[PDB]
A paper describes a structure:
The macromolecular SMN complex facilitates the formation of Sm-class ribonucleoproteins involved in mRNA processing (UsnRNPs). Here we report on the identification and structural determination of the SMN complex from the lower eukaryote Schizosaccharomyces pombe, consisting of SMN, Gemin2, 6, 7, 8 and Sm proteins. The core of the SMN complex is formed by several copies of SMN tethered through its C-terminal alpha-helices arranged with alternating polarity. This creates a central platform onto which Gemin8 binds and recruits Gemins 6 and 7.
The structures of HsG6/G7 (47) and HsSMN/G2 modules are known but the basis of G8-mediated bridging of both modules has not yet been established. We therefore expressed and purified complexes composed of the S. pombe proteins SpG6/SpG7/SpG8115–166 and the corresponding human proteins HsG61–92/HsG746–131/HsG8190–230, respectively. The human complex allowed structure determination by X-ray crystallography and the generation of a homology model for the S. pombe orthologues. The C-terminus of HsG8 adopts a helix (α1)-turn-helix (α2) motif and interfaces with the N-terminal helix of HsG7. This interface comprises several highly conserved hydrophobic residues of HsG7 (A60, L67, L70, L71, F92 and L97) and of HsG8 (Y205, I212, M215, A218, V219 and F223). A hydrogen bond is established between the sidechain amino group of HsG7 Q56 and the carbonyl group of HsG8 R203. In addition, salt bridge interactions between the guanidine group of HsG7 R63 and sidechain carboxyl group of HsG8 E216 are also established. The corresponding S. pombe proteins SpG6, SpG7 and SpG8115–166 share 21%, 29% and 21% sequence identity, respectively, with their human counterparts. This allowed us to build a homology model of the S. pombe SpG6/SpG7/SpG8 complex based on our crystal structure. Our results thus demonstrate a conserved modular architecture of the SpG6/SpG7/SpG8 sub-complex.
Author numbering:
A (entry chain F): 191 to 227
B (entry chain B): 47 to 131
C (entry chain A): 2 to 86
Write the structure that this text describes.
Amino acid sequence: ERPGERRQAEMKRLYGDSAAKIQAMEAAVQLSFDKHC
Amino acid sequence: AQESLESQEQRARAALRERYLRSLLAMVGHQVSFTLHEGVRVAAHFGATDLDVANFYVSQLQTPIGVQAEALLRCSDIISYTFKP
Amino acid sequence: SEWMKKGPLEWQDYIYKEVRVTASEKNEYKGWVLTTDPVSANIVLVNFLEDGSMSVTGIMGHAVQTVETMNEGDHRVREKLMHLF
């Protein structure tokens, strides 16, 4: 089970070539939050 | 061979999302004011938002009744929010 | 509706325009479009205040009723929003 594959496909549908850039951004914003959320 | 319309849409989504995500990061370490239902105006210290749904995790939420040390303001509860970078 | 069914290139064309937004509970906003979150359709406006500072307001996409373009906005707007964060 690879529970994130559906999400990855949707991120590719939405963002195309930029999908990994946007994923990295969302990760980094999370970190900035999770630091002191 | 030209960039498709879909590829252009995807770049615009990514540009829009990047600008939005920067605006959320800009709220870290700031107060945020909210316009809620029934015309209620509150404000708090920003903590986080969810990145799927625009829920806000805040601290020292000031309401017309008192202060709540921690609060989750659900996206369905909010009409607008305002802050000063 | 209407705002929430726009596509990303349509949302993107509002960036740097001055708009009037009407929202739930007869809330009204005028400001310069910074971005639209493509996930939520949340609209993010920037206001240039009289004291020279800037505020940023997010309107929940589900609360938006109408968005009317008021002015097109010049290169100084672009520079201001560029140095916002």
